[PDB]
Amino acid sequence: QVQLQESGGGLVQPGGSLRLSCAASGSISSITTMGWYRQGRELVALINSVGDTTYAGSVKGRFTISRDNAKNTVYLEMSSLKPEDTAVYYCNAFMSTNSGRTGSFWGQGTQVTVSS
């Protein structure tokens, strides 16, 4: 019972910056983490329900992950972009219940291209 709406992204020059957004709706209370992954589908940045943040070594100091809890939206503030940052970036929300049931939800994938 989580829906994710991705937005943002596009084309930037090397050293450029972009914001990705991933809006969540539905069973928010059960989400333990949300994050962006690129593609192996590898972790870029994650934020958990208490706001702890985790960054891939390749992106730390350049990318910031944040949330606006007033809108259940998580943001990936990409900066100092490199051509190797070029990829489809997917938003994930991972859900865990009291029951022990779990769920994993993925957005449709947002293209980021860093070039010329």
Side-chain angles (χ1 to χ4, degrees):
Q1 27 181 44
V2 173
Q3 306 92 61
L4 300 170
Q5 177 60 61
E6 289 184 25
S7 56
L11 172 82
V12 293
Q13 264 187 134
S17 60
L18 264 192
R19 187 177 73 170
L20 309 187
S21 303
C22 182
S25 51
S27 302
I28 302 304
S29 72
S30 271
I31 298 175
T32 59
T33 64
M34 283 188 62
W36 295 90
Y37 296 67
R38 59 173 285 191
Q39 122 230 296
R41 195 175 279 193
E42 64 196 279
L43 174 64
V44 173
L46 177 158
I47 183 167
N48 70 9
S49 53
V50 297
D52 299 340
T53 55
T54 298
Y55 301 96
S58 62
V59 310
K60 59 169 170 198
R62 308 189 292 123
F63 293 8
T64 303
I65 193 181
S66 62
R67 61 182 176 167
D68 177 358
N69 264 23
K71 307 186 170 187
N72 303 132
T73 301
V74 166
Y75 301 103
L76 184 66
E77 282 283 359
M78 299 175 87
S79 74
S80 300
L81 276 160
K82 294 162 149 111
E84 54 270 44
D85 296 319
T86 300
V88 178
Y89 284 77
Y90 295 90
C91 173
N92 173 82
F94 187 80
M95 134 173 303
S96 164
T97 63
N98 304 138
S99 345
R101 323 262 226 285
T102 64
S104 187
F105 307 84
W106 290 98
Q108 41 205 279
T110 299
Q111 177 71 227
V112 177
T113 310
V114 186
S115 170
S116 289

